[PDB]
UniProtKB/Swiss-Prot annotation:
Organism expressing this protein natively: Homo sapiens (Human)
Enzyme Commission identifier(s): 3.1.3.48
Boundaries of every Tyrosine-protein phosphatase domain copy: 2-276
Catalytic center residues: C214
Membrane topology: Peripheral membrane protein
Cysteine sulfinic acid (-SO2H): modified positions: C214
Name of the protein: Tyrosine-protein phosphatase non-receptor type 1
Function: Tyrosine-protein phosphatase which acts as a regulator of endoplasmic reticulum unfolded protein response. Mediates dephosphorylation of EIF2AK3/PERK; inactivating the protein kinase activity of EIF2AK3/PERK. May play an important role in CKII- and p60c-src-induced signal transduction cascades. May regulate the EFNA5-EPHA3 signaling pathway which modulates cell reorganization and cell-cell repulsion. May also regulate the hepatocyte growth factor receptor signaling pathway through dephosphorylation of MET.
Modified positions (Cysteine sulfenic acid (-SOH)) in chain numbering: C214
UniProt keyword terms in alphabetical order: Acetylation, Endoplasmic reticulum, Hydrolase, Membrane, Oxidation, Phosphoprotein, Protein phosphatase, S-nitrosylation
Known catalytic reactions: O-phospho-L-tyrosyl-[protein] + H2O = L-tyrosyl-[protein] + phosphate
Shown residues in whole-protein numbering: 2 to 283 of 435
Enzyme superclass (EC): hydrolase
């Protein structure tokens, strides 16, 4: 029982202590390509880089670098591409990846501006009549429709490979209510957001992996992925009480560094899963 474990950590207020153990045990792999001088401007943060073994490679002979990692959960049979919020110069790389990986959905967990500063480039068109064109990767992006709700917004986008004239419908799932500081009050809205993404089929195997991001693509993105897999795992195994979130997180951390950046975030992940399990259980 993780809820029981939850109350023990809260009781003895040892969240920070536990988050730190996870941090210490976490994997550590080379990020050589990410550190190459040529890719300097392709990274938003100096300390957040994709391990070389799990990075996403753009299908171009020039520079195949993009700060994104493929997190493959074998047991859950769920894959996710966690990446940083694109930069002024990597928006075309970002959509090239979505196209190349055959992604159906894009999950954004932050706002373009937070705490008074740019946390992500405006990488999608805000008006139907103002489509965007990324000349470097020869891609056209069009806002087909948008649905703004209290806690999030779903956008229907059309991505066209100008080279082939081929087009695909991309679902933009944007969580707009994540607090500037700390984590959400209750996991409620977050979980609903997750289920909406699920319902879309964006997380399903008949499509490429979903593309998730916030600013660094490790903190909030990690929460989204950790929560989803754990819930899925409790839905698959014979004993849902066997799903160890700390264990799952460490497994994901073999694919990208720093998933879950704070003890608050970790605590929140527990809430999300515990609260999500009460509903998803039936
Ligand atoms: O974009 C992220 O991965 C995010 O999770 N980060 C956070 C880290 C600690 C506390 C809160 C957050 C948050 O945004 O909810 C971040 C991780 C790594 C580097 C970051 C640089 C700037 C920033 O605003 C958030 C970062």
């Amino acid at each position: 029982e993780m809820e029981k474990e939850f109350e023990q950590i809260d009781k003895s207020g040892s969240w920070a202590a536990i988050y730190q153990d996870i941090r210490h045990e976490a994997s550590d792999f080379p990020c050589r390509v990410a550190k190459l001088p040529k890719n300097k401007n392709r990274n938003r943060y100096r300390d957040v880089s994709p391990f070389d073994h799990s990075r996403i490679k753009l299908h171009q002979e020039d520079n195949d670098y993009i700060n994104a990692s493929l997190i493959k959960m074998e047991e859950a049979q769920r894959s996710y591409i966690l990446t940083q919020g694109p930069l002024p110069n990597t928006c075309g790389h970002f959509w090239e990846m979505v196209w190349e990986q055959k992604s159906r959905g894009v999950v954004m967990l932050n706002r373009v501006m937070e705490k008074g500063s740019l946390k992500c480039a405006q990488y999608w068109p805000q008006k139907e009549e103002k489509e965007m064109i990324f000349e470097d990767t020869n891609l056209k992006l069009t806002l087909i429709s948008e649905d703004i709700k209290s806690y999030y917004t779903v956008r229907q986008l059309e991505l066209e490979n100008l080279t082939t004239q081929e087009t695909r419908e991309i679902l933009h799932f944007h969580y707009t209510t994540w607090p500037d500081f700390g984590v959400p009050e209750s996991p409620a809205s977050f979980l609903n957001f997750l289920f909406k993404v699920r319902e879309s089929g964006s997380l399903s195997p008949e499509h490429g992996p979903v593309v998730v991001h916030c600013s660094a693509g490790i903190g909030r993105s990690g929460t989204f992925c950790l929560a989803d897999t754990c819930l899925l795992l409790m839905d698959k195994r014979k004993d849902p009480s066997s799903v160890d979130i700390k264990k799952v997180l460490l497994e994901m951390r073999k694919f990208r560094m720093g998933l879950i950046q704070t003890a608050d975030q970790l605590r929140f992940s527990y809430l999300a899963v515990i609260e999500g399990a009460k509903f998803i259980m039936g």
